[PDB]
C-alpha positions as a LaTeX table, in Angstrom:
\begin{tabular}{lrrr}
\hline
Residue & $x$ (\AA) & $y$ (\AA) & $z$ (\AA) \\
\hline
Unk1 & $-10.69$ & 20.57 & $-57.78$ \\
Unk2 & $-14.24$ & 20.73 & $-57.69$ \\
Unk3 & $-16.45$ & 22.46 & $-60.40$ \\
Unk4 & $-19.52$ & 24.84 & $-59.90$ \\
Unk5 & $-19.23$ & 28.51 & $-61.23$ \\
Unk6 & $-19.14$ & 26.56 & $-65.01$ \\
Unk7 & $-21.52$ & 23.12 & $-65.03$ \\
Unk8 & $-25.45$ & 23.88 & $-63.97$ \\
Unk9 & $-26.52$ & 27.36 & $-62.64$ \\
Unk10 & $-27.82$ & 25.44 & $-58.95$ \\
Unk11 & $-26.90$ & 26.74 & $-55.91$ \\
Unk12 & $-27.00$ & 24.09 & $-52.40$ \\
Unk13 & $-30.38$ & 26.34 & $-51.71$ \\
Unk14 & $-32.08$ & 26.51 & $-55.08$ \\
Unk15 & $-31.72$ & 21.98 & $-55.55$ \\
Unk16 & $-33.97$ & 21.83 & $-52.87$ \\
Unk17 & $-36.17$ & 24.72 & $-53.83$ \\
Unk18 & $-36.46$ & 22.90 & $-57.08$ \\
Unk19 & $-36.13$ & 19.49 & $-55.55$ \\
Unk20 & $-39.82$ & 20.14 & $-54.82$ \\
Unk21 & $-41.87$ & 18.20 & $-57.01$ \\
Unk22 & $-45.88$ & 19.00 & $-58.16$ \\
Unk23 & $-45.51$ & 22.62 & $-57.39$ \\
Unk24 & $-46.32$ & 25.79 & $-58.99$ \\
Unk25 & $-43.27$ & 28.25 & $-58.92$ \\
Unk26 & $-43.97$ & 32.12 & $-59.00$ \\
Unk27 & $-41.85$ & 34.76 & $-60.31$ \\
Unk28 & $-42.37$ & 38.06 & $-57.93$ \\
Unk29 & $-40.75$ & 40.74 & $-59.74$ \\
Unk30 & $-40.91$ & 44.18 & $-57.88$ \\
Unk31 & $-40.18$ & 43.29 & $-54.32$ \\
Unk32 & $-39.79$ & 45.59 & $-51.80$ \\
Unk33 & $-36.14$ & 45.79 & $-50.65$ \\
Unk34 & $-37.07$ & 45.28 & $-46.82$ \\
Unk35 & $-39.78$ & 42.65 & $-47.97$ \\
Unk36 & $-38.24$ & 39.25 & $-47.02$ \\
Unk37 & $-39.06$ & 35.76 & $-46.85$ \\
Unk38 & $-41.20$ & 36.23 & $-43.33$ \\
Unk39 & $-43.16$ & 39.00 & $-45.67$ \\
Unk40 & $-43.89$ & 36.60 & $-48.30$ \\
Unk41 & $-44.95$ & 34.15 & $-46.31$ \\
Unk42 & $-48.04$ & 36.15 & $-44.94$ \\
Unk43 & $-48.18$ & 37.62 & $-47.99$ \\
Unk44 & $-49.53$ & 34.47 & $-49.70$ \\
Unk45 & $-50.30$ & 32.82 & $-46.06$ \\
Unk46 & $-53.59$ & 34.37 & $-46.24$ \\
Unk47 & $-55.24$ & 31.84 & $-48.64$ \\
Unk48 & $-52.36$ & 30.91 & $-50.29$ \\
Unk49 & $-49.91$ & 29.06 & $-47.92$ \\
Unk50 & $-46.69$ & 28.50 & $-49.22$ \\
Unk51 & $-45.06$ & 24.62 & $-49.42$ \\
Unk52 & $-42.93$ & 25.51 & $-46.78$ \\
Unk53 & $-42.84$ & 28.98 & $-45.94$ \\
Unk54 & $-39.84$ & 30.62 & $-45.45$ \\
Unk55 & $-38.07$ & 27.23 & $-46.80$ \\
Unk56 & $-40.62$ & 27.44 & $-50.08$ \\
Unk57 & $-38.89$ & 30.78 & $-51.28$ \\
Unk58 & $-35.95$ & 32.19 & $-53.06$ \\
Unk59 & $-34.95$ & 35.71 & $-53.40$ \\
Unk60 & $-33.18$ & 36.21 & $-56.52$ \\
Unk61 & $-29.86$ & 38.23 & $-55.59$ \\
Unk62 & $-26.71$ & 39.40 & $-57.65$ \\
Unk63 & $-23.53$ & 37.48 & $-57.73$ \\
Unk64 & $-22.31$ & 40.47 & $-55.15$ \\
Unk65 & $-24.88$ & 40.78 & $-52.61$ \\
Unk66 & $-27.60$ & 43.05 & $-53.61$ \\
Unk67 & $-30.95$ & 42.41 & $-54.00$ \\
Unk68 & $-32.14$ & 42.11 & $-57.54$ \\
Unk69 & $-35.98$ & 42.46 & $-56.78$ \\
Unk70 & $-37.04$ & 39.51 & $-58.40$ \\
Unk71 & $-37.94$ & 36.46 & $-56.74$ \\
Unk72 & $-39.35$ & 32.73 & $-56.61$ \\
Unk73 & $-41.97$ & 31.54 & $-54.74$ \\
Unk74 & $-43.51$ & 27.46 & $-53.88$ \\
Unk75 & $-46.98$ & 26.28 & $-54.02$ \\
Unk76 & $-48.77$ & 22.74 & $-53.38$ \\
Unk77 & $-50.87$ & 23.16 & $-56.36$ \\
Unk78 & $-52.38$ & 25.14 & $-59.06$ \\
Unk79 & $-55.11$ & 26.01 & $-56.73$ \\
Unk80 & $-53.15$ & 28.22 & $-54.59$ \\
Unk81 & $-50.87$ & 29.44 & $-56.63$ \\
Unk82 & $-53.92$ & 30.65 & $-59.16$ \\
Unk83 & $-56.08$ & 32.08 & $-56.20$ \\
Unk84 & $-52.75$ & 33.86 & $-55.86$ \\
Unk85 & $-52.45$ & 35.32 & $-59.37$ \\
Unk86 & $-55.59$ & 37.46 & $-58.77$ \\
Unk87 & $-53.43$ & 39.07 & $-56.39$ \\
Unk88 & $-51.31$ & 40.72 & $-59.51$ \\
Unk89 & $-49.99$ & 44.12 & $-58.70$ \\
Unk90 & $-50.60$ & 43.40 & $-54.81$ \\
Unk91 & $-49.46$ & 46.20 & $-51.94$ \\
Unk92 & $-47.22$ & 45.14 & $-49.75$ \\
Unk93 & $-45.88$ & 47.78 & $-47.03$ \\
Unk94 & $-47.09$ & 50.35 & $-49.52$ \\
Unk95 & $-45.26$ & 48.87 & $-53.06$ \\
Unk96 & $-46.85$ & 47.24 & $-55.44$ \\
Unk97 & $-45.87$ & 43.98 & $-56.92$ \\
Unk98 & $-46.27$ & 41.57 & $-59.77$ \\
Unk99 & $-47.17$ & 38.00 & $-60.11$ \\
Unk100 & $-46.59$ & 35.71 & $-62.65$ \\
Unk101 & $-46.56$ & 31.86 & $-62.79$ \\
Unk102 & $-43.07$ & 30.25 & $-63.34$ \\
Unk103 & $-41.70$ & 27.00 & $-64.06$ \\
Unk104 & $-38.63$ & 25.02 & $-62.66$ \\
Unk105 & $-36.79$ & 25.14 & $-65.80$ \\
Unk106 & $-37.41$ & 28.81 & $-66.27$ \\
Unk107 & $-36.26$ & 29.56 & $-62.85$ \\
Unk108 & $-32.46$ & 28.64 & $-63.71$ \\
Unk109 & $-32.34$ & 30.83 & $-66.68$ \\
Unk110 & $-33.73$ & 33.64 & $-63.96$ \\
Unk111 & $-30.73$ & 32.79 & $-61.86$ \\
Unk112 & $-27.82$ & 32.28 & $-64.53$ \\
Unk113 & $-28.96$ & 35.61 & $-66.48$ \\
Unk114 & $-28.23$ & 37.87 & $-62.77$ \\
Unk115 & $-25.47$ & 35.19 & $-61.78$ \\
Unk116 & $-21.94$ & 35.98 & $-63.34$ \\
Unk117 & $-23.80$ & 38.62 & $-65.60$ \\
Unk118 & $-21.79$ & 38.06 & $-69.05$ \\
Unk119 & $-23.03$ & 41.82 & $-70.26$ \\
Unk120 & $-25.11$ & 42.22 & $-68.02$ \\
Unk121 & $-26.86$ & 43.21 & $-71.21$ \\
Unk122 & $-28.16$ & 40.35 & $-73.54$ \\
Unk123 & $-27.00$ & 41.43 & $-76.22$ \\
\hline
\end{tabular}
C-alpha cells in the first residue's frame, strides 16, 4: 500500500522540476492550447534560455487530461527570468500571454488547487 493522492501534491515530474535549486520559476497563464514545451522553449530561447528546455517546464493539466492553460517555467537566474518579464502579454502563434514570477512553494498550491479539484470552486 503505497500513499500519494493524500501526503504532498508532487508528481515523479514536478520533484525534479522543483529539485532545481537557484532558479526563478514563472507562472504562464494563458497558453495557447497547441503551444507546448518545444514552443516555450524558443519562446524564452531568444534571450532567455530556459535551465533545461523542454526538461525546465511544466504544463499545468487537470487531474483528467485537459489542458488547464496555466503553466511553469525554469530559469538560471533572476537575470533571465526578469529580461523575460518585459515580455508580459507576449504573442505567441497569434495569442497573447502573461508572465508572472513564481516561487517553488507557490507552484504546489498551483498544482493541488487543479489536482483532485475539491469544488473546483474555493469556496
Amino acid at each position: 500500500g503505497s500513499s500519494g493522492s493524500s501526503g504532498g501534491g508532487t508528481s515523479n515530474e514536478v520533484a525534479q522540476f522543483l529539485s532545481k535549486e537557484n532558479q526563478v520559476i514563472v507562472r504562464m497563464r494563458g497558453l495557447p492550447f497547441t503551444a507546448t514545451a518545444e514552443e516555450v522553449v524558443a519562446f524564452f530561447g531568444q534571450h532567455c534560455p530556459i535551465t533545461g528546455g523542454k526538461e525546465g517546464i511544466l504544463f499545468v493539466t487537470y487531474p483528467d487530461g485537459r489542458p488547464t492553460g496555466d503553466a511553469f517555467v525554469l530559469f538560471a537566474c533572476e537575470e533571465y527570468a526578469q529580461n523575460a518579464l518585459r515580455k508580459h502579454k507576449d504573442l505567441l502563434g497569434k495569442r497573447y500571454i502573461e508572465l508572472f514570477r513564481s516561487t517553488a512553494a507557490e507552484v504546489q498550491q498551483v498544482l493541488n488547487r487543479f489536482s483532485s479539484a475539491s469544488g473546483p470552486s474555493s469556496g
